[PDB]
Amino acid sequence: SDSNTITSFQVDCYLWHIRKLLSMRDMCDAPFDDRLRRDQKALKGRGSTLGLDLRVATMEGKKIVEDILKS
Amino acid sequence: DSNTITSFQVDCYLWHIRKLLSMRDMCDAPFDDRLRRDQKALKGRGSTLGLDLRVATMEGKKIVEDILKS
RNA sequence: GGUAACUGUUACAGUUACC
RNA sequence: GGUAACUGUUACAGUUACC
């Protein structure tokens, strides 16, 4: 598999999770929710294409983001 | 509108995180394509709202850290 | 339209913010 | 109606992953 393809998917999953948290707290505007919906479907399609569980990918993306932010 | 401003500040900080991934050469070409699209989009939204991008990015960082704290 | 995701340019319908 | 961003749809041209 292509490493940067996987990494990009895992990071994208984690940042979708962060955006969803904002929406769940009623702190985002309507276009932000529209993009959340578009990206939600896109990540499901990418996960199916790569054969990856979305929850596992999210946790991996969390660790990647945390590792970069710490440096 | 507070939710409009909050969404912009968060989007600014999340763009910053994505750009750091790109600068480490850890991302794929479509990820970079979206980074360029969103750079243009945020410039337009920042102009429309009258908000400084550096300051909004710092405020987005605080918001993101606060909602994650829970 | 190979599957999936996306980008640039264009149009329409619409959403949100602002006037 | 306008400015900006976006969502859906569409036209043209592309990018990446997939032995």
Author numbering:
A (entry chain B): 1 to 71
B (entry chain A): 2 to 71
What does the paper say about this structure?
Based on this rationale, we designed a model double-stranded RNA made up by the annealing of two synthetic RNA molecules of the same sequence. This synthetic palindromic dsRNA, named AWFC01, harbors one GUAAC motif at each of its blunt ends and is perfectly symmetric thanks to a central uracil nucleotide that stabilizes the RNA duplex by forming a non-canonical U*U Hoogsteen base pair. To get insight into the sequence-specific recognition of the double stranded RNA by the RBD, we solved, at 1.75 Å resolution, the crystal structure of the complex associating the wild type H7N1-RBD to the AWFC01 duplex (wtH7N1-RDB/AWFC01). The overall structure of the RBD in the complex is identical to that found in the apo form, with minor side chain rearrangements at the binding interface of helix α2 residues R37, R38, and K41. The H7N1 RBD sits almost parallel to the dsRNA helix axis and overlays the minor and the major grooves of the duplex. The assembly buries 1173.8 Å2 of the RNA solvent-accessible area (17.1% of the total) and 1156.7 Å2 for the RBD (14.1% of the total). In the complex, the RNA keeps its A-form conformation but a curvature of about 20° is observed, stretching along base pairs 8 and 9 at one end of the duplex. All direct interactions between the H7N1 RBD and AWFC01 occur via phosphate/amino acid and sugar/amino acid H-bonds and none through base recognition. Surprisingly, this revealed that in the high affinity dsRNA (AWFC01), the RNA axis is bent in a non-symmetrical fashion, whereas in the two other complexes (aaH7N1-RBD/AWFC01 and wtH7N1-RBD/ZKO*), the RNA axis bend is distributed symmetrically from the centre of the duplex. For AWFC01, axis bending is at a maximum between the seventh and eighth basepair at one end of the duplex, right after the GUAAC sequence. Instead, we observed a pronounced asymmetry in the network of hydrogen bonds that links the dsRNA to the RBD, owing to the position of residue R38 in polypeptide chain A. This skewed network pulls the seventh nucleotide of the two RNA chains, thereby locally bending its axis and skewing the overall shape of the dsRNA.
